[PDB]
Each structure stands twice: as C-alpha cells, then as structure tokens.
Design a protein around this motif. Structure first.
Motif, PDB file in Angstrom:
ATOM      1  N   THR A   1     -36.171  25.547  12.202  1.00  0.00           N
ATOM      2  CA  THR A   1     -35.136  24.708  12.798  1.00  0.00           C
ATOM      3  C   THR A   1     -35.534  24.233  14.191  1.00  0.00           C
ATOM      4  N   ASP A   2     -36.233  25.077  14.957  1.00  0.00           N
ATOM      5  CA  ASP A   2     -36.657  24.671  16.294  1.00  0.00           C
ATOM      6  C   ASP A   2     -37.746  23.606  16.229  1.00  0.00           C
TER       7      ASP A   2
ATOM      8  N   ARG B   1     -28.620  30.955  19.904  1.00  0.00           N
ATOM      9  CA  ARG B   1     -28.202  29.584  19.652  1.00  0.00           C
ATOM     10  C   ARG B   1     -28.504  29.111  18.239  1.00  0.00           C
ATOM     11  N   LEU B   2     -29.538  29.655  17.599  1.00  0.00           N
ATOM     12  CA  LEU B   2     -29.981  29.186  16.291  1.00  0.00           C
ATOM     13  C   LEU B   2     -29.463  30.032  15.135  1.00  0.00           C
ATOM     14  N   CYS B   3     -29.449  31.354  15.273  1.00  0.00           N
ATOM     15  CA  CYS B   3     -29.113  32.239  14.160  1.00  0.00           C
ATOM     16  C   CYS B   3     -27.607  32.488  14.151  1.00  0.00           C
ATOM     17  N   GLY B   4     -26.931  31.991  13.112  1.00  0.00           N
ATOM     18  CA  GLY B   4     -25.516  32.248  12.963  1.00  0.00           C
ATOM     19  C   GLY B   4     -25.228  33.666  12.506  1.00  0.00           C
TER      20      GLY B   4
ATOM     21  N   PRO C   1     -27.658  26.548  13.081  1.00  0.00           N
ATOM     22  CA  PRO C   1     -28.042  25.762  11.897  1.00  0.00           C
ATOM     23  C   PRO C   1     -28.253  26.591  10.637  1.00  0.00           C
ATOM     24  N   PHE C   2     -28.257  27.923  10.715  1.00  0.00           N
ATOM     25  CA  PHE C   2     -28.454  28.719   9.512  1.00  0.00           C
ATOM     26  C   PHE C   2     -27.693  30.035   9.604  1.00  0.00           C
TER      27      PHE C   2
ATOM     28  N   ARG D   1     -33.718  35.702   9.325  1.00  0.00           N
ATOM     29  CA  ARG D   1     -32.747  35.528  10.402  1.00  0.00           C
ATOM     30  C   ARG D   1     -33.425  35.280  11.741  1.00  0.00           C
ATOM     31  N   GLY D   2     -34.595  35.873  11.955  1.00  0.00           N
ATOM     32  CA  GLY D   2     -35.293  35.713  13.212  1.00  0.00           C
ATOM     33  C   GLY D   2     -36.415  34.700  13.153  1.00  0.00           C
ATOM     34  N   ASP D   3     -37.654  35.196  13.081  1.00  0.00           N
ATOM     35  CA  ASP D   3     -38.834  34.369  13.322  1.00  0.00           C
ATOM     36  C   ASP D   3     -38.856  33.110  12.459  1.00  0.00           C
TER      37      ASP D   3
ATOM     38  N   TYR E   1     -43.612  35.085  21.057  1.00  0.00           N
ATOM     39  CA  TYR E   1     -42.326  34.398  21.188  1.00  0.00           C
ATOM     40  C   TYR E   1     -41.246  35.047  20.322  1.00  0.00           C
ATOM     41  N   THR E   2     -41.279  36.374  20.233  1.00  0.00           N
ATOM     42  CA  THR E   2     -40.244  37.117  19.527  1.00  0.00           C
ATOM     43  C   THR E   2     -40.228  38.545  20.050  1.00  0.00           C
TER      44      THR E   2
ATOM     45  N   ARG F   1     -32.578  31.569  22.780  1.00  0.00           N
ATOM     46  CA  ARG F   1     -32.884  30.756  21.609  1.00  0.00           C
ATOM     47  C   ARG F   1     -32.323  31.381  20.338  1.00  0.00           C
ATOM     48  N   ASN F   2     -32.444  32.705  20.202  1.00  0.00           N
ATOM     49  CA  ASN F   2     -31.933  33.379  19.014  1.00  0.00           C
ATOM     50  C   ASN F   2     -30.412  33.320  18.952  1.00  0.00           C
TER      51      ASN F   2
ATOM     52  N   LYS G   1     -34.046  41.596  19.222  1.00  0.00           N
ATOM     53  CA  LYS G   1     -33.165  40.430  19.250  1.00  0.00           C
ATOM     54  C   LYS G   1     -32.112  40.480  18.149  1.00  0.00           C
TER      55      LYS G   1
ATOM     56  N   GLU H   1     -35.733  30.515  12.646  1.00  0.00           N
ATOM     57  CA  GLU H   1     -35.735  30.010  14.015  1.00  0.00           C
ATOM     58  C   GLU H   1     -36.880  29.031  14.227  1.00  0.00           C
ATOM     59  N   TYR H   2     -38.057  29.338  13.674  1.00  0.00           N
ATOM     60  CA  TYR H   2     -39.201  28.449  13.845  1.00  0.00           C
ATOM     61  C   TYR H   2     -38.984  27.119  13.139  1.00  0.00           C
TER      62      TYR H   2
END
Lengths: 740, 411
Positions: free
Chosen positions: A250-251, B386-389, A370-371, A242-244, B327-328, B383-384, B332, A247-248
């Motif tokens: 897709t980014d 926006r990306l993690c649903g 996106p996920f 879910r995190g690192d 970067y984490t 960023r988190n 979060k 995120e990496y």
C-alpha cells in the motif's frame, strides 16, 4: 521455480528467457489472461513489477528505471474517454550505451504504443536529472513491445531500428488526446492534427504533458517477503501480512499515486488494484511455487493465493477481497465469507490441507487503514438442498442460502449474460435435479422425528416450456412443489398431486418458485402455503396444468457403487462401467422428463449426483487442468495459449496414511441421434488425448502418479437403459504422470 | 455461519449476567463456544423455544467459574421438561454428545420406531424384516451423522445396542473426534494411575502445527486437570515447538488464566530457553490481537503481555523485539495494538492512565536499547498506525498523530 525472473530477463533484453518465465507465471495464475484487456490491468501489472524490482534485489541501483502511463484518452469514434493505456518503461545504466525501452499494452496496434519524440525528450530529461553529464550521442535506444490479447496470444517484439525522425513516433496516445481536447474535436485524425498550427505556449504545454517518473528503491528490502508467507502457522502469516507485506504494497502504491490517478477518467480501480497486487507476487514467481486464484467476474473482486517452495502440503491460504468504494473493514467481511467457503470457489484447497485461512480486506484508495486482516477456519462444502427447501418454508434467509448454493456451483467458464442464458438455465436445473434426485437422506423435521421423501418430477405438456418442476413428499409431513423456470415460462395453474398417497391429516402443500430473470439473477419468491392436501386437491380441479407426474426411482445403490469407485476400484474399468449402468438405470424412466437437452444439462446432472453422494469428497465441473503454449532487425516472438479443461474431476480427501486423492476425470459429450454417436465418441476420445499431454497440471492435485480418464457420451436417442450412457467397452484410461 | 446464527448467539449471550464483569465476559465466551458446537440444533429456535436455554444458562449450577459444568449442563439438556417449559432440543443428540449413557439408547429407540413406522409394509419386498430394520437404522444414523461424526458413536449398527467403550479406548477416540464433552467424560472413567498420562497424551497430540479453534477447549481442560505441570513441560519438550502450539491455541480462545498459570510455572518458577524469539513475538502479537477483539478482557490480556515480554529469561528476546531494522520492528504489532486499546471510545475503562504508562514505558525501552535507531522506530510506528487497520480503531482518525504526541511527551 527455476527461472531467472521476469524483470531480470526483460531488462537484459533476453526475450526468450522472459517468455519462458512468463508462461511459467501464467501457469500459476490460470485466470490472468481473462482480464488483460480490462482497463489498465496489464499496464499496472507490469508497472508494479518494475516498481518493486529494486526492493526485491532484482535490479541494481545503477539500473535506473523510468516510466509513464500513456493514457489512450478520448475515443475518436464515440467521444467517450477510454480507461486503457500503454505503459512505457525505459531502463538506463550509467556506462551502458543501450537504453532499452518497453511499450506494454494489450494490443500491438493500440493507439500511440510506440515511444514518441516528446517521450524520448522527456525520458532524456529525466535521465539527465541524475546524470548531469549525459551525452545523448552515446545513447542507443532499443525499443520493445510486450502485448497479450484474446484464443489468447502473447507477443514479445524487438522493434526495428528506424533512421532519423522515424526513430520515434510523431505522437503518443496522450498527445493525440491533448490536441483533440485543445481543438475541441475528438474525431480529428492524426494527419488532420499534424496540419494544425500551435503557438509557442501550446507547444510548451504539450512538451510537459508527457514526462517520465523515476522508480526509486525504498528503505525496505522485500527479498524474504514470500518466506514469511510460506508458512503453516496462521498467526505468523497474519502478522507478516498485517505488518511488512501489506504495509509495503500500500505504501508503494501511495508513492506513485499521482502517476496512477491523474490524466485518466473512468479508471477501473478494481482491475488496476488486482493488477498491482499481482505484479508484486509475480516478482517472486521464479523462486516459489505460488498458486493464484483470481475471480474478477462481475460482482466479484476476490484473489486467493498460496505460497510455498514446492512440496509443502499444509501452507496457509490467503484470501483477499479488493474493494474500491466500500471501506476495507467491509471488504474483510466479504473476504472472510469467501474464505469460509473456499472449497466452493477456489482450487486453492486442493493444493493445501490447511483448515485455517487468512482473510484480508484491502482498498488502495484509502489513505488511513487501507487494509484489515483476520483468520478464519475453512468449512466443508456439504449443502443439503432438499433439507433446506423444507426449512426455508418457515425460516428467513434460507432462500438466500439456497440461491447461493445453486449460483456458486455454476461453472466459472460460462459468463452470465443473455447470450449464455440457456447455458446457465441448463446448469441450474441439471444441478438441482441431480442433488435432489440422488440425495438418499430422509427429511429431518424440527421436532424429534424423521420421514422418508418420495421425489417426483413433472413433465409439462408443452415441451417448449423451460421449467423444472419437482415435488418432494415427506411421509406424514408437508409437500413441497419446486419450480425453476425461465423468464418467459410463467404459468397459471396447479400441479395435480392426486397420484400421491397422503395419509396424514395435517399434510400441507407448499410452492417454492424460482425464476432466472433476464439479468441472470435467480429470484426465489416467498414460499406459499397452498393449504391442506385434500383442500388443495378439492380446489384447482379446473386449474390443473397439463402434464404427467413421474416418480424418481430409488438411487441408494449409486452411493454404494460410488464408494467403491472412488476408493479401491478407481482404476478398474468394470467398476466405472457399473456405476454408469446404474445412473442410466435411474435416469431412463424420466429421461424425456428431465430433458437432457445439452452437454451442460448432462454435465450438471452428474455434478449434482456426485455432489450429493458422500463419495466423491469433491467434484469440480469444467476444471482447468492447465494450458499449452505454441511458438510461432526485428524479432517477433508470438505464443498461442490453449487451455485444457476437464468436464468433471472427482477427488478424494487426503488422509494421513492415504495421500493419493485418486483423481478421476470424465469427458462428457451428448449425442442427439445415432449419426452423432460415433462423432461424439471420437471427439471425446480426442479430448482425452489432449488431456494426456498435460502432466504439470495433475501433479499438484495428487501424491500418486496416475490419473484415471474416461470418455462418456450421453445417447439421447437410446431406447433401453443399457445404451443411455455410452461407456468404453473392453488400457488407455490410466494416465501415467511423468514427474521427471 | 448464517445470519440467524449470529442472532441466536447474541440472544443467548445477553442472558449472561454477573456482578464481576471479568466473570461475565468469560461466561459469554463459553456460550459462544457452546453455540459454535450446537448451532445445528438451535439455528431455527424462536424466542418461545429459546426460553428453555435461557433458564438453563441462568442456573448458576451450570457454571464453574467462567466455564460450563458439562455434568450439570448435560443433565438439564437431556430433561424432557424443566419447570413448565418443554425441552425443544433433539434429546438424542444431547445425550450422545454429553455421554448420558442412561438415556442414549431409549431416546434413539423412539426415533428409530417412529421412522420405521413411516415406511410402507410392502416397500422393499426383497428384504427380510431383519434386513429392513437394519436398513432403517443405518439410514437414520446416516441422517443424524450430517450434524457431526460423533452422533453415531454410541449406537452399534449391527445390534442397535448401546456401544460399550473402555476408559482408555473411549478417551483416545474422543480426542481424535475433537469432542470436548466426550474427552472429559472418559477422563473421569480412567483409573487414577493413568489420568495424568492420558491428559498429557491429548495435549501433545493436539498441540500440532495445524490445530484449530475447536481444539482449544480440550487443551484447556487437559491442562487444568494436570497436577505436575513441570513434568508436562518435559513431555511437551519432546516434540518440536510443542510448547508454542499449546500456548498459541489457548491464547486465540482467550484462555488467559490458563496461559498465565503455564507462564508462571515454566518461566517464573542455563541458557536453554523453552521457545524461540519468533514464538516470543507471536505470543505477544496474538495476545494484542485478542485484546482488541475482547475489550472486556483487555486487562487480563495486557497483564499476560507484560508477564511474557518482561520475563527476565527473555531479556535478550525483549531487546531484539524493539530492534528497528529493514524499516520494521517486531514490537509494532504489540505497541500499536496497545495504543489503539488505550484510545478506543466504544468502552468505559477505569484505568486508561495505567495503559498510557505501559505505552510510554515500552517506547522508552525501545529508545534506550537503540538510540541511533529511534528516529526510524518512530517513523515505522507512525506508518504502521496509519496503514494497518484494527478492531477498536476509530475510523477516519489519524492514529499516527497519537504516536507523534506520545513521542513528543518523552522530549
């Protein structure tokens, strides 16, 4: 693992080291080579490897990487825009004179594979953006080709250095497309295009139509990302995905979105998305034992993988569904359903005893969310076919479950096209018969009652009619007629059920008709109540089909023998011989009715038989054990890839004090007459020797060091049951696993 | 499961009514656990047959707070008929799993005789009647066994008799079978001097790396019936990560009141801590996960998050959880979930302002611990988001903008 890393070897120009490391990755993704020609699957796969190598501490910062997608564009032979390309990558390091260039595509003769003159200038232009003091005279270009295409072969080639202008090609793939569009004539040849003149504005546009992009490391190191996934705790795996990790991925995809999406039409988002994810995982393949299971068949976009160092037995499987149009929250529902039934779809549950999985829906095209990630428990694959057939009479959605049961157990190696229609039909009918004819359980009625089932199979008068007809008569309850016919096997008539002894006064006759249509989908019509038994027999006296109804003999002794075979007697040849003597005894009465017409039919019948019986716990049809690799100023390294498959693989469930799964493998052949018998035994025994050459494929599936293999030949023209299924008479069946 | 299984689950959950919405939300989760156990018996029930279960679960006598009373429930579920509605369930399976020992053998004898009567008398002319009846009993027991391994537990296969079990023997067997009602039944058969010990044995046996959701109701029952929770901690500490495994599985099943009791006993009454920095972070992120999955229980989940996060014994863990590096940042998967919970529009919450207060305090804590990393912290959080649903997240809405608005509020 023990490799140097794919990108590290490639960048160093170690073509042999890259080859061994890549075939090691291919062992980890057994379905990788089925899709190397699907769109830009291979270029995006290698691009993802190059674009995440710095973040994984594979490349140094001073090892600058530049790339471009050289899209093939319009096909000069049909005018349609292609969705394939060549990936072109160059690595430059200040102080090193050698600039290694790599051209990656599925075929070495793919259009515009070589670096072009304008691609050299665009690359040098990009290099000079970071190095303003660049002297081109001190640059030595080393040009390479990396290709893999379907048997399958993969080639790593060091191109010969050419002098003068021949050093680089005249046009790349996209340049030819650019000029064909400019001249509005997609059939023009390169020689014709050379003849055409270009004004100063057109040449300026053509020069900037090719341009390289520098791959830049980000602010996040991913060295330990696989450590996060090599865990037996589902909450830890879910949090890390879910995190690192996600995120990496897709980014990083977003950072190159303009280079991925532009200058191509009809892009295959499905295969490129899977290739991108695989390139990320492949950057760790030299340091971890990663198993990747890919189902990219039509109507499927699944990737299930397992991350461990090597010996871990309970690490969490990760099941991903890659959507391209639906939102990822819908893709998560599909991934959750795929993970719940992982024993049906994947070999991953053979490599881990975890009852928990992490499921992921992912769609790279979405900018927001996106996920999505969730966890779900792993369920057992124990579908009762005959029981659900009676249940689907009055209940919705059971027909879909019955259809899914049959289709999902088809061998993945058989494509579902019109060319393989008879192959699919043989597999469905054979599997459905083995399940129903060898299920020993009585019918369980909805009310508190149980009734035994007498099973029949109907032999149609026309021996060319492709239709499996079976009748299930529960005592004191209803009667179900099951049909599984081809598209051209439609009939008008009724099956005569006068031979049945119907004692109840409420016994109904039902009809469940299945048809495998020309699109190879399985349509199950709504079940039809044909009325009371005596009412049904009164009518249709002038509408009974020609044929004979044969009763299925009792098969209870097969389950008891299978229990002894898979457990204490798995290495005793006499025990296996007795098992097939009893299967032969049950099949010989109806051999010409069930019609064992092909190797697929024979294999599917045994698959259904072994599935229905409690033992074995798991049976896999056409299971890929592994593959074999043969090796065959220019250096061309060509490797031919040969797959080793097991017709049937039987496995126990690992217990706490019994880690040995007792792997049993059967090589199945069919002989139509006596002349083929000797040649089928010889081919089956030769296939056994090919399997005995594979050791690394059998090691992860068992904790022991032995695998039992037996050649089996079905004798279609046998006259007695004792010779129906030919078993070796009288060593040679215990394959000792060399873990050294 | 199947699509029909989701429908019958929703139908049974709709029957649960209660003034206290916290009690009603907890009882609906108990119905979910009941359905997941007995779905094979109710999957094809229409509304006419489902009405029997509606009236059973409407009976307040079947409940004890937010948990089902297995003693009352097992009684009603084994009745042939309650108030003009016939019991549609297969009563042998109900009496078996609920250990109604007075009815197990009679109900099975009925099924055995009607099944034996459907075989022809001349079916097997090699077997004796002794062998014929035993074959019929084994075939019947093997048939019911498909619904679960616990359904041949009470019938001896040689005699057809009701099996007899010692209190300790049956307790250990039901724990291994992951059988909630059997564990509670044999617990009440145990001698008083052994009750605390056997419950502790079940807890440490099930608090293992690969526990499943089915284990949570057993762990909840065992913890709730243990008097000396301080001694339980000491026995759990004899096994690596045993404390994490117990709390983690309880959290995933929303046993918040049980986790709060354990947190208060073991953390609120030297330098030795009972779980690690990673256990600490996984507690909070898992609570944030079920908070979004169960909005009606978000108040209880938030309270548990704050109890664990702000516990003075883990002040060092709390500071590390807001350290932005590589970067984490570990928080979060907690701060983001809290922002999503605060902003969700599918519910009518009374205390959204308290939720905003917690979010702003968490952000201010991260800023105060590492001021030089706050810019990266904000960047990472946006960023988190926006990306993690996530569940409860409004689709198509930029939640990174919500984070930007909160950061701007704190100057």
């Amino acid at each position: 693992s023990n490799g140097d890393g794919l990108i590290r070897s490639l960048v160093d120009g170690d073509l042999e080291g890259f080859r061994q490391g890549f075939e090691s990755f291919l062992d980890q993704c057994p379905s990788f080579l089925y899709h190397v020609s699907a769109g830009r699957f291979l270029p995006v796969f290698f691009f993802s490897m190059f674009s995440t190598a710095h973040d994984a501490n594979i490349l140094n910062a001073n090892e600058r990487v530049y790339f471009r997608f050289d899209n093939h564009g319009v096909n000069p032979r049909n005018g349609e825009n292609r969705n394939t390309a060549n990936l072109k990558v160059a690595v430059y390091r200040d102080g090193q004179q050698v600039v290694r260039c790599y051209s990656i595509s599925d075929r070495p003769n793919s259009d515009g594979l070589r670096f072009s003159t304008r691609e050299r200038n665009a690359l040098v232009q990009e290099i000079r953006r970071q190095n303003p003091n660049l002297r081109e005279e001190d640059l030595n270009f080393e040009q390479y080709k990396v290709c893999m295409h379907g048997a399958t072969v993969f080639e790593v080639i060091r191109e010969k250095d050419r002098q003068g202008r021949d050093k680089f090609a005249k046009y790349s793939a996209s340049e030819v497309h650019f000029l064909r569009q400019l001249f509005r004539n997609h059939r023009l040849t390169i020689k014709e295009i050379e003849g055409r003149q270009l004004n100063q504005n057109q040449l300026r546009q053509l020069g900037r139509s090719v341009n390289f992009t520098r791959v830049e490391p980000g602010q996040q190191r991913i060295d330990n990302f696989m450590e996060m996934l090599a865990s037996n705790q589902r909450q830890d795996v879910r949090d890390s995905l879910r995190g690192d990790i996600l995120e990496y991925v897709t980014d990083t995809y977003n950072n190159y979105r303009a280079q991925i999406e532009n200058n191509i039409e009809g892009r295959s988002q499905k295969f490129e998305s899977h290739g991108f994810l695989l390139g990320f995982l492949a950057n760790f393949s030299h340091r971890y034992t990663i198993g990747v299971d890919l189902d990219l068949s039509p109507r499927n976009s699944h990737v299930a993988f397992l991350v461990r160092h090597q010996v871990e037995r309970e690490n969490i499987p990760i099941v991903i569904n890659l959507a391209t149009r639906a939102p990822p929250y819908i893709a998560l529902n599909r991934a959750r359903s795929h993970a719940e039934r992982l024993h049906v779809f994947s070999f991953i549950p053979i490599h881990t005893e975890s009852r928990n999985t992490v499921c992921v829906g992912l769609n790279f095209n979405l900018n927001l969310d996106p996920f999505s990630v969730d966890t779900v428990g792993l369920q057992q694959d124990r579908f009762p076919l005959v029981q659900r057939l009676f249940e689907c009479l009055e209940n919705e959605g059971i027909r879909e479950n019955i259809r899914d049961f049959l289709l999902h157990h088809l061998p993945a190696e058989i494509p579902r096209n019109a060319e393989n229609y008879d192959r699919i039909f043989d597999c469905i009918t054979g599997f459905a018969f083995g399940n129903s004819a060898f299920d020993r359980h009585p019918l369980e009625l909805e009310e508190e009652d149980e009734a035994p089932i007498t099973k029949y199979i109907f032999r149609h008068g026309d021996e060319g009619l492709r239709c499996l007809t079976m009748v299930f008569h529960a005592e004191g309850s209803d009667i179900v007629i099951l049909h599984i016919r081809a598209h051209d096997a439609q009939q008008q008539g009724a099956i005569n059920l006068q031979t049945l002894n119907v004692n109840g006064n409420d016994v109904h006759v039902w009809e469940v008709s299945c048809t495998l249509n020309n699109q190879l989908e399985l349509d199950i019509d709504l079940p039809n109540d044909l009325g009371l038994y005596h009412d049904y027999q009164n009518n249709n006296a002038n509408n009974f089909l020609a044929g004979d109804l044969v009763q299925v003999p009792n098969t209870e002794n097969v389950h008891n023998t299978l229990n002894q075979v898979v457990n204490d007697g798995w290495k005793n040849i006499a025990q296996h011989r007795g098992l097939f003597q009893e299967i032969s005894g049950a099949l010989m009465p109806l051999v010409d009715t069930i019609n064992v017409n092909s190797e697929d039919k024979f294999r599917s019948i045994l698959h259904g038989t072994f599935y229905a019986s409690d033992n074995p716990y798991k049976v896999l049809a056409m299971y890929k054990v592994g593959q074999t690799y043969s090796l065959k100023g220019e250096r061309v390294i060509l490797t031919r890839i040969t797959e080793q498959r097991l017709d049937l693989l039987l496995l126990r469930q690992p217990r706490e004090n019994d880690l040995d799964t007792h792997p049993i493998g059967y090589v199945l052949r069919l002989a139509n007459n006596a002349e083929e018998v000797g040649q089928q035994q010889n081919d089956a025994r030769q296939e056994i020797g090919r399997l005995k050459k594979q050791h690394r494929g059998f090691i992860p599936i068992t904790s022991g060091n032995e695998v039992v293999l037996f050649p089996i030949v079905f004798n279609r023209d046998a006259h007695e049951a004792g010779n129906l299924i030919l078993f070796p008479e009288g060593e040679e069946h215990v394959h000792r696993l060399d873990r050294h | 499961e199947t699509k029909k299984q989701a429908e019958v689950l929703k139908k049974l959950q709709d029957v649960i009514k209660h003034t206290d919405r916290d009690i009603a939300a907890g009882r609906k989760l108990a119905i979910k656990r009941w359905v997941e156990t007995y779905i094979e018996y109710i999957k094809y029930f229409k509304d006419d047959k489902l009405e029997f279960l509606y009236n059973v679960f409407r009976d307040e006598g079947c409940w004890l707070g937010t948990r089902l009373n297995n003693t009352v429930l097992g009684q009603k579920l084994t009745e042939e008929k309650i108030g003009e509605i016939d019991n549609p369930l297969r009563r042998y399976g109900m009496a078996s799993r609920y250990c109604i020992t007075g009815k197990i053998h009679p109900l099975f004898q009925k099924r055995f005789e009607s099944y034996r009567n459907k075989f022809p008398p001349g079916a097997f002319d090699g077997k004796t009647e002794t062998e014929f009846g035993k074959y019929v009993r084994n075939s019947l027991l093997d048939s019911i066994k498909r619904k679960g391994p616990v359904f041949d537990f009470w019938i001896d296969r040689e005699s057809g008799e009701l099996k007899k079990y010692d209190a300790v023997e049956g307790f250990d067997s039901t724990v291994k079978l992951k059988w909630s009602e059997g564990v509670e039944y044999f617990y009440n058969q145990l001698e008083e001097k052994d009750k605390e010990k056997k419950l502790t044995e079940a807890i440490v046996a099930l608090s293992r790396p690969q526990s499943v959701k089915r284990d949570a109701p057993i762990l909840d029952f065992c913890v709730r019936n243990i008097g000396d929770k301080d001694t339980l901690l000491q026995k759990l500490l004899q096994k690596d990560k045993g404390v994490y495994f117990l709390l983690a599985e309880l959290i995933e099943s929303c046993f918040f009141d049980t986790v709060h009791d354990l947190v208060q006993c073991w953390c609120y009454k030297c330098s030795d801590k009972i779980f690690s920095q990673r256990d600490y972070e996984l507690f909070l992120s898992s609570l944030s996960d079920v908070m979004l999955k169960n909005p009606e229980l978000s108040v209880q989940a938030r309270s548990l998050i704050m109890e664990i996060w702000k516990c003075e014994r883990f002040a060092e863990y709390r500071e590390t959880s807001v350290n932005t590096s590589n970067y984490t940042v570990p928080i979060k998967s907690v701060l983001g979930e809290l922002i999503i919970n605060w902003k969700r529009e599918d519910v009518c919450k009374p205390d959204r302002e308290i939720e905003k207060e917690e979010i702003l305090d968490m952000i201010s804590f991260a800023k105060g611990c590492f001021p030089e990393k706050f810019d990266l912290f904000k960047e990472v959080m946006i960023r988190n988001l926006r990306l993690c649903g996530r569940e409860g997240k409004r689709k198509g809405v930029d939640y990174g903008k919500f984070a930007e608005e909160l950061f701007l509020q704190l100057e």
